[PDB]
């Protein structure tokens, strides 16, 4: 019987999508998007992945089931990407990877594993964080507490407020860290802050969980991983949920991984069998296409070279738009100090607009941003930059 | 901390897989498989789906996210397949479909929806049923009770034992029905038994849940759906979890659907928004490739004609192997009455071997079957039929 079923709440970002595509004005700019767009305003499929897909089409002979944890080459390629090509974690075989449906699937199977096999009751998420983090852990019945993160005034990482909230977390509490390109703020810990965090975590008995969705968008693939690697040098156990949605432009093929690391090569196998049991009772075994694309790009040097170039071009495009935004706002002129945008990493940052200012942006100018003032920098193109900055200067 | 984590139990069928592929004898036959195989012993990718994939490769311009419920054409094609091309359910818009990662994903999001939004506490599953049914519902915290189904003696549907167990189910309990090709037995209700079941269900207040994984393997696409359609004529609400894994040979692309039907066009939307919320907290939005393949085959008549022929050829191959098995056992000769195999539908049936007899099959003859005596008829080829029947006659 379903007549007393309460409609689910209006989706905190998709509402803007539907609202946007009902405006009769092409001067309208949607900076609320969440996905990368190139200078043309389009989300292309990469050249390297169309090459990989022609290859798969020429060479696949069966669509028979992958094992629960997916394609093995995909697994070894992702823990080399994560941990570095000769890491002790990999040589001692203390990491196991399950291929999952995107980074969100990786977080739900991590959550289900934890809820069914360990005694964790709370996951600490930054304030702010990606909003679907609360939903994911709560559906497995983990409670979500949040730690201080953002300084709204200097638009930076309030590190002392952050370590001071974390002293409320007990041993065996899970603390979620964004690997790089913190969503929504774009502020990430410096390597020195990652190390003190790696060290305080070990002392206090935090189980670290990295949400690593943007490898390659802050600085480069290896550099973006130095934070996770600092925890991994120091921790016997950790979980990283990574996603290939954004750095391979493979969003809708759902390709991600859930890597479990344990003290040794044998407790990780014992724990991984239950992670596998958690996957079997959810979607059974993972979608092969997008993970086969990633595995064949990364293991083929000609293809990986091309991918790498397509990714530093996406990274550079975003860094150019953060730069063009800050001084185009300084040509259109307002009491501002939007330069903090040049310090933030990846596609998102809080613009510092009030909810009323984003409201007259949507309403009076057709500039759509998320009510928190979060803007997706990749929705800026050299051509739409000047109408955007005008609209913004006119509401400040 | 993971050192007290108990290893998950040895997988009830995959153990045979690993055991099989460690035999030095190519006379070895694995009838434990679960996937379809053709006369060559191979699980090919269909011609229609390689054609659909060349088309997608030529024509996709983005991998941007599908909406939570997936591609809309895939949704309308599956509820026409399920309900018939002009069904009142479709014209009154009382059905909504979410594209899911396989039929197992469709069952976990049905389970999560139910556990979070309704007051169901128990799901009735046949005894026997597909073993991952218990796991799926239990991970959402629904308890699984089982109803009588199989008569081990006459190898048939013990219908009176079945309606007599079901009288233990209260109103608002969920009762799971296999749409056709009951796994593991291959015995399905006749249309007359579906109708009395449709009628008793409505009286008693059962929420019916169809697990519909084998459309097209018993009789034809339309005929295989007449059981579900009889419930759907009579019910205001029902859920069907369907899978395209087997009838499209798309196993590892994870393509399935979860269809929710409610009294009207507006309570189904209200309920569907929460089903959507249950998807967002699990894998976010579904894998596009395999569902794009199904949607383009089914909406293109030249491609659908080809698919249809490839599916009646898979159906016919299985019906020929059930027939060749029964009289090859009657040429090799033993006190048998294996003719019940000719009455069962789809790829599986219980052979009626004891667990000790399947054990000396694996051990002494290299014939691998599941310990319950379940055999996958599609693992029989005209060439391996005679060694198989010999091994079997020699253990009876
Ligand atoms: C995009 C994102 C994810 C995962 O996305 P998928 O589409 O599920 O791969 C996880 N965490 C954060 C912070 C993200 O921004
Ligand atoms: C195969 C099967 C499913 C679903 O399989 P997926 O691979 O997840 O599509 C569901 N129920 C039964 C009875 C099955 O045999």
UniProtKB/Swiss-Prot annotation, chains A, B:
Cofactor: pyridoxal 5'-phosphate
Induction comment from the UniProt entry of this chain: Transcription is increased specifically in response to 2,4,6-trinitrotoluene (TNT) and its indicator compounds 1,3-DNB, 2,4-DNT, and 2,6-DNT.
Record-level GO cellular component terms: cytoplasm; cytosol
GO molecular function per UniProt: identical protein binding; L-aspartate:2-oxoglutarate aminotransferase activity; L-tyrosine-2-oxoglutarate transaminase activity; protein homodimerization activity; pyridoxal phosphate binding
Biotech use: Has been used to construct a 2,4,6-trinitrotoluene (TNT) biosensor strain.
Mutation effect (residue 65 to F/S): Slight changes in activity
Catalytic activity: L-aspartate + 2-oxoglutarate = oxaloacetate + L-glutamate
Top-rank taxon: Bacteria
Family matches, as InterPro entries: Aminotransferase_I/II_large, Asp_trans, NHTrfase_class1_PyrdxlP-BS, PyrdxlP-dep_Trfase, PyrdxlP-dep_Trfase_major, PyrdxlP-dep_Trfase_small
Residues holding L-aspartate: 34, 130, 183, 374
Main location: cytoplasm
Outcome of mutating residue 133 to A: Slight increase in maximum velocity of the overall transamination reaction between aspartate and 2-oxoglutarate
Enzyme class (EC, first level): transferase
E.C. no: 2.6.1.1
Sites of N6-(pyridoxal phosphate)lysine modification: 246
Record's keyword terms, sorted: Aminotransferase, Cytoplasm, Pyridoxal phosphate, Transferase
Keyword Iron-sulfur in annotation: no
CDD domains reported in the protein's UniProt record: AAT_like
Protein family membership: Belongs to the class-I pyridoxal-phosphate-dependent aminotransferase family.
Subunit annotation: Homodimer.
Protein name: Aspartate aminotransferase
Protein's organism: Escherichia coli (strain K12)
Gene field: aspC
């Amino acid at each position: 019987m379903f007549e007393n079923i309460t409609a689910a709440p209006a989706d905190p970002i998709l509402g803007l999508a539907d609202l946007f595509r009902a405006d009769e004005r092409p001067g309208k700019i949607n900076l609320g998007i969440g996905v990368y767009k190139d200078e043309t305003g389009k989300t292309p499929v990469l050249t390297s992945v169309k090459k990989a897909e022609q290859y798969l089409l020429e060479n696949e002979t069966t669509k028979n089931y992958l094992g629960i944890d997916g394609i093995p080459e995909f697994g070894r390629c992702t823990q080399e990407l994560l941990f570095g090509k000769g890491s002790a974690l990999i040589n001692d075989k203390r990491a196991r990877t399950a291929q999952t449906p995107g980074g969100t699937g990786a977080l739900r199977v991590a959550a289900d594993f934890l809820a069914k096999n360990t005694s964790v009751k709370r996951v600490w998420v930054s304030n702010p964080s990606w909003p679907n983090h609360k939903s994911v852990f709560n559906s497995a019945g983990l409670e979500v507490r949040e730690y201080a993160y953002y300084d709204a005034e200097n638009h930076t990482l309030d590190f002392d407020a952050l370590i001071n909230s974390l002293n409320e977390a007990q041993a065996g509490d899970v603390v979620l860290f964004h690997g790089c390109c913190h969503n929504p703020t774009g502020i990430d810990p410096t390597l020195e802050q990652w190390q003190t965090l790696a060290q305080l975590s070990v002392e206090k008995g935090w189980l670290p969980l990295f949400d690593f969705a943007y490898q390659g968008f802050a600085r480069g693939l290896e550099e973006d991983a130095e934070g996770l690697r600092a925890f991994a040098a120091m921790h016997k156990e950790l979980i990283v949920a990574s996603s290939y949605s954004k750095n391979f432009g493979l969003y809708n093929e759902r390709v991600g991984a859930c890597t479990l690391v344990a003290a040794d090569s044998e407790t990780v196998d014992r724990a991984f069998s239950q992670m596998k049991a958690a996957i079997r009772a959810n979607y059974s075994n993972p979608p092969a296409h997008g993970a086969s694309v990633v595995a064949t790009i990364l293991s083929n040097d000609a293809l990986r070279a091309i991918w790498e170039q397509e990714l530093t071009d996406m990274r550079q495009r975003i860094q150019r738009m953060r730069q063009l935004f800050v001084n185009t706002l300084q040509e259109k002129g307002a009491n501002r100090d939007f330069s903090f945008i040049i310090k933030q990493n990846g596609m998102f940052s809080f613009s510092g607009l009030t909810k009323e200012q984003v409201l007259r942006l949507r309403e009076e100018f057709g500039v759509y941003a998320v009510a928190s003032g979060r803007v997706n920098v990749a929705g800026m193109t050299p051509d739409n930059m000047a109408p955007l900055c005008e609209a913004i200067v006119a509401v400040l």
